[PDB]
Amino acid sequence: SGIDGISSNESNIKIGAAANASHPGGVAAVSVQAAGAPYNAFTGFSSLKGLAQAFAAQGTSNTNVTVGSKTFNISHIPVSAMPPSHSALGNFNFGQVGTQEVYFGEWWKAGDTPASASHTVYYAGDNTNTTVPTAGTATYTVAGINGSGSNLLSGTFTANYGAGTLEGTLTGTGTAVSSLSLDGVAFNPGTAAFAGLATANGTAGIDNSGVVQGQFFGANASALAGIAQFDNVSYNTAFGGAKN
């Protein structure tokens, strides 16, 4: 019980819980494993939102973005906008699913781009209260991050709880990925973790090498989050969704 999540490269990014919290295990956090001490500590995403607000005049941003009926708080933290002593922490773009304890995002090393091998995607959320129905259907409004803090992928995912399948496609402009389609993404009915394959289209053409991993979160599966990794790392994407 507590924070669950996945990173596409644990040499660069690990997810966990913020230490010394009022809710041990309940505050989603991220560690830049690519950095040495003291830059590799686990920092709560909530604190990173605060930094993205605090450095806004220098080029970071924190914005409540509406996608249909849902709000996704987006934090954009490029190395170029942060003081030199923060260069080892690298570049972040991440989102929060509403006010739920569910975060999803990406990272890459200082001096790299999202096309570089260090492009890493992750999600993190509190599993403590998660339950998933064993029957019926629901839809989610989903936002995706792919190499940008200003242009998001968006779409609707459909959860078939009786069949144990998650289906749908995200689309967007201004990112390497133009469309991302779940292929056989599935879960045991009544359980939270899902995985499968994916196909992206975009500025490099079709890439069907995608592997998707994620999970439902919250009472009655009020949210979901996950990652999609491809042979072409510029297509690596993190996503989060709120149940409609």
Residue numbers in the entry: 21 to 264
Task: List passages from the publication reporting this PDB structure.
Here, we show that A. baumannii Slam secretes HphA, which functions as a hemophore that acquires heme from hemoglobin and albumin. HphA is composed of a C-terminal 8-stranded β-barrel packed against an N-terminal clamp-like structure through 6 intermediate β-strands. Once secreted, HphA has the dual capacity of binding hemoglobin and scavenging heme. HphA along with its cognate receptor, HphR, function together as a two-component receptor required for full virulence and facilitating extrapulmonary dissemination and/or survival in the blood.
To examine the heme-binding potential of HphA, acid-acetone extraction was used to strip the co-purifying heme. The resulting apo protein is devoid of heme and refolds to its native conformation as indicated by the absence of a Soret signature in the UV–Vis spectra and X-ray crystal structures. All apo HphA chains adopt an open conformation and do not show structural heterogeneity in the heme-binding region. Comparison of holo and apo structures reveals that the loop containing H43 undergoes a large conformational change upon heme binding and release, while the 310 helix containing H106 is only slightly displaced. Apo HphA interacts specifically with hemoglobin conjugated to agarose beads as evidenced by pull-down. The visible spectrum of unbound apo-HphA after separation from holo hemoglobin beads confirmed the presence of a Soret signature indicative of heme piracy. Purified apo HphA does not support growth of HsmA, HphA, or HphR mutants, but rescues growth of the HsmA and HphA mutant in combination with hemoglobin as the heme source. Based on the pull-down results, we propose that apo HphA binds to Hb largely through its heme-Fe coordination residues, H43 and H106. This mode of binding is plausible as the loop containing H43 is flexible and could wedge itself into the heme-binding site, positioning HphA to capture spontaneously released heme using H106 in a relatively quick step. The loop containing H43 then dissociates from Hb and clamps down on heme in a relatively slower binding step.
